[PDB]
RNA sequence: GCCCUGAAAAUGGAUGGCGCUCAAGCGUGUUACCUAUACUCUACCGUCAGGGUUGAUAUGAUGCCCUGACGAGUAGGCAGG
RNA sequence: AAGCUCGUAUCAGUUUUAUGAGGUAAAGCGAAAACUUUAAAUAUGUAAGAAGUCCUUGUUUGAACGUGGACAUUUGAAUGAAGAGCUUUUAGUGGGCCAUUUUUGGUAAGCAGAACUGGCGAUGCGGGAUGAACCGAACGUAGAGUUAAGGUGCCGGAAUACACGCUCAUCAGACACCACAAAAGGUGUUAG
RNA sequence: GGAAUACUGCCAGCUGGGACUGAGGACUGCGACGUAAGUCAAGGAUGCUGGCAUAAUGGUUAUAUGCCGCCCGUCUUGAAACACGGACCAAGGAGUCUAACGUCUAUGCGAGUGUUUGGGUGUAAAACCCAUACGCGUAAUGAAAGUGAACGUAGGUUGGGGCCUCGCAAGAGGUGCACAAUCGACCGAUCCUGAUGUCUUCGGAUGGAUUUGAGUAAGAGCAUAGCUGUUGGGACCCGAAAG
């Protein structure tokens, strides 16, 4: 999605990227838990 | 845009006959509008107080213009002075009629009006408020 | 060259992602990350607004009203001149009228008869 | 207009009408539009009291404006109501009718034979 | 009440177009034309006849 | 290009039938002719639209007159009977 | 349906003119297809004046955020038309096939997905011997006339018409196709 | 060298045969021919003659002949069929009543409106008369305590139907009802501003920045009836497996 030219839906591409960042952060939180336990 | 009064008022049909003939042979737009109004239902024919008549006679050079209310002319105990100008209308509630006459007016009706002014010269057509009940 | 909200734009490209690829719509948001455009898209018989973000590497500024500008100048100036010195105006555009007669003279253009031989 | 004709070529049979056929078509099927009422010409004052604004004050002035395409030709041509012709009185002259006039059919440009077809359809 | 066709009905035809009377009076539908004697060009005869 | 083989079962059988062979077959050309609720013109019904008329001495004004175009119809809708 | 605000100088399943893009490639000429200028429609896209047009200064010369002042109708392309608009409102509706065209992927062969446009349903009538989808076709009651699609041996209204070629089949063909058996054989015939 | 014919086209060229129709119902128009009186193929058919007068024409009906015509209704709408109902006749037979809200229209009165719980009277379940209350409406907004709608000609602005003025109009000016767009005003709630002063915590000043309300900004409702909508009652009619 950060590649093509138009999306046909505040740009939603940046929103895609920030959503993925929240996802990998949830991964990191559930990994910090697992490595604490 | 209905083309006949849905009422079987004998007198309303007589007035519609008069105003069809006048609108057909005068070419003064006052007749076209007064006729088109004579076809209006009861929720589209709302009442005009005597207060709006006073507030309209307040205008410039509207001193001797008779006012014409196709609907009915109710009363308003919230004023304390009425001018002395002729008012013509369909129906006059007895309060308003007594007020107009006590100040000195004349509640001619629409056919005395037809005689007094066929083309409608020197007249104010007042329409009451409508968007109240919704 | 920078944008402002509401100027009729064009589009272009530098593949098979979403082919409008030629439409002229109005921009609505001059953002750094992208430019958003509205498109009049027909669904059955229904001109709808389609909102779409684009990257500014494939967008050019339409100039479709420059002709109207130039012709406003032409026509106003012409009718002013015509009010100055009074002759016929004909200050309206016309379709191509058909040509009239003329004599095509053969003194050096003698005709040459050819068929699909080729020769 | 040429683009319109190219577009509807399959469904019409157009051509270049001449003076004689214009004249007979207008004396016979000539009906004017007056208050949206297809009134037959049948007169002169009829034409006159609607096309007097453009100086067309007979039926020959009208035929003149139509044939020597004039400044008010849009006005004359919309005053006339679309002629409603009869089926051709000698047949269309072909077995099958929906091919281009060039392929031995009947639709499309027919540059000069439209006079013959129309006189027959009159 | 009834549309009467010109191009017949001489009365209608002369009601419209008061000129049809002189048309018929001079026989203008069968008017001649003088004998022009412009023999044409050899180049035109060639490019017609010749292949 | 026509023509013949170029495969297909099982009650009797279908270029629709009869029949056709310088065709009543195939390609093509010029004419003439036949026929739809289609197209033109006319008369009548109805609806819609545009004009006119509440004047005696005679009417039905929700009427009377003049003009033009149109008419399939299920669920539904409106109107007159 | 009603209300109200116009009889719109307004709109249109349309063309043009402008400028768009996809330029396939016919350019052609380059430095020797070698570019890149470019082109027809191929098919869409937005725009073509009344609030427009400007003339005169307050503002972070620019762009205008403010004025005031001129050009009503040659007032700004072709064609058609009056049914255009906006508020309240109210009944049925929701299932689904065929074809065409644009396009993506397919394999024994069909085909599957899209998008658009017809048709069908609610719809009779002429023709195709018969018929959901094929060819014509604007359904009040009648008269006359002329034709569409299809036809003209007889059934059956209408030339056993006219003209040029071809073919003989021990079950021709009249086919409907711009499909399948279809690649071939043949000492049948005709023209190249 | 000089012709004619063919083909194509034009005539407001002449001339003949056939078919269908004859709507309208004093005059008015456009014309044309004639000096004019007049006449006419010009805003729709008349003139002359015959036969019969009643089953001759027309209507009804049985049949014959030519051509056409798949059996009705329902449900699936595609083998658009299948399937389901149909022996025949008569009578019966299925969107009704009521309550509550709501809509559109009609009528009465109108800042009002509503007589019929009840009383009076009566020719007696009718009609006629009537007091006191009560509902809705004429005031909103707050979670609540509570507070509660004029700076102005009830306001400027932009349109706006009608009317006035000018001139013949076009056009121009004047005023502009309804309603709409916009900026203001007022009341309630929210945030601050915090007094005159106070039994010291009560009192609540000025202004602004917000928002918001079917808010006000010279009222429009109340009642009855008809047509309709929704919900609830057996609820368009018949039909189920039960507790």
Swiss-Prot record, chain A:
Residues 20-37 are annotated as: Disordered. Disruption phenotype: Depletion causes defects in processing of pre- rRNA and assembly of ribosomal subunits. This is Regulator of ribosome biosynthesis. Belongs to the RRS1 family. It is found in: Nucleus. Component of a hexameric 5S RNP precursor complex, composed of 5S RNA, RRS1, RPF2, RPL5, RPL11A/RPL11B and SYO1; this complex acts as a precursor for ribosome assembly. It comes from Saccharomyces cerevisiae (strain ATCC 204508 / S288c). The chain holds residues 154 to 201 of 203 of the full protein. Required for ribosome biogenesis.
UniProtKB/Swiss-Prot annotation, chain B:
Its main location: cytoplasm. It is found in: Cytoplasm. It comes from the Eukaryota. There is a cross-link at residue 102 (Glycyl lysine isopeptide (Lys-Gly) (interchain with G-Cter in ubiquitin)). GO terms for molecular function: RNA binding; structural constituent of ribosome. GO terms for biological process: cytoplasmic translation. Keywords: Cytoplasm, Isopeptide bond, Methylation, Ribonucleoprotein, Ribosomal protein, Ubl conjugation. GO terms for cellular component: cytosol; cytosolic large ribosomal subunit. The modification N6,N6,N6-trimethyllysine is found at residue 36. Belongs to the eukaryotic ribosomal protein eL18 family. Component of the large ribosomal subunit (LSU). Mature yeast ribosomes consist of a small (40S) and a large (60S) subunit. The 40S small subunit contains 1 molecule of ribosomal RNA (18S rRNA) and 33 different proteins (encoded by 57 genes). The large 60S subunit contains 3 rRNA molecules (25S, 5.8S and 5S rRNA) and 46 different proteins (encoded by 81 genes). eL18 interacts with NAP1. There are 2 genes for eL18 in yeast. Component of the ribosome, a large ribonucleoprotein complex responsible for the synthesis of proteins in the cell. The small ribosomal subunit (SSU) binds messenger RNAs (mRNAs) and translates the encoded message by selecting cognate aminoacyl-transfer RNA (tRNA) molecules. The large subunit (LSU) contains the ribosomal catalytic site termed the peptidyl transferase center (PTC), which catalyzes the formation of peptide bonds, thereby polymerizing the amino acids delivered by tRNAs into a polypeptide chain. The chain holds residues 15 to 148 of 186 of the full protein.
Swiss-Prot record, chain C:
One of its GO terms (molecular function) is structural constituent of ribosome. It is found in: Cytoplasm. One of its GO terms (cellular component) is cytosol. Disulfide bonds: none annotated. It comes from the Eukaryota. GO terms for biological process: cytoplasmic translation. Belongs to the eukaryotic ribosomal protein eL21 family. Component of the large ribosomal subunit (LSU). Mature yeast ribosomes consist of a small (40S) and a large (60S) subunit. The 40S small subunit contains 1 molecule of ribosomal RNA (18S rRNA) and 33 different proteins (encoded by 57 genes). The large 60S subunit contains 3 rRNA molecules (25S, 5.8S and 5S rRNA) and 46 different proteins (encoded by 81 genes). Component of the ribosome, a large ribonucleoprotein complex responsible for the synthesis of proteins in the cell. The small ribosomal subunit (SSU) binds messenger RNAs (mRNAs) and translates the encoded message by selecting cognate aminoacyl-transfer RNA (tRNA) molecules. The large subunit (LSU) contains the ribosomal catalytic site termed the peptidyl transferase center (PTC), which catalyzes the formation of peptide bonds, thereby polymerizing the amino acids delivered by tRNAs into a polypeptide chain. There are 2 genes for eL21 in yeast. This is Large ribosomal subunit protein eL21A. It comes from Saccharomyces cerevisiae (strain ATCC 204508 / S288c). The chain holds residues 32 to 156 of 160 of the full protein.
From Swiss-Prot, chain E:
N-terminally acetylated by acetyltransferase NatA. The chain holds residues 312 to 362 of 362 of the full protein. There are 2 genes for uL4 in yeast. It comes from Saccharomyces cerevisiae (strain ATCC 204508 / S288c) (Baker's yeast). Component of the ribosome, a large ribonucleoprotein complex responsible for the synthesis of proteins in the cell. The small ribosomal subunit (SSU) binds messenger RNAs (mRNAs) and translates the encoded message by selecting cognate aminoacyl-transfer RNA (tRNA) molecules. The large subunit (LSU) contains the ribosomal catalytic site termed the peptidyl transferase center (PTC), which catalyzes the formation of peptide bonds, thereby polymerizing the amino acids delivered by tRNAs into a polypeptide chain. Signal peptide: none annotated. The gene is RPL4A. Belongs to the universal ribosomal protein uL4 family. This is Large ribosomal subunit protein uL4A. The eukaryote-specific C-terminal extension harbors a nuclear import signal and delivers the ACL4-uL4/RPL4 complex to the pre-ribosome, triggering uL4 release from ACL4 and incorporation into the 60S ribosomal subunit. It comes from the Eukaryota. Changing residue 8 to A: Significantly diminished nuclear localization.
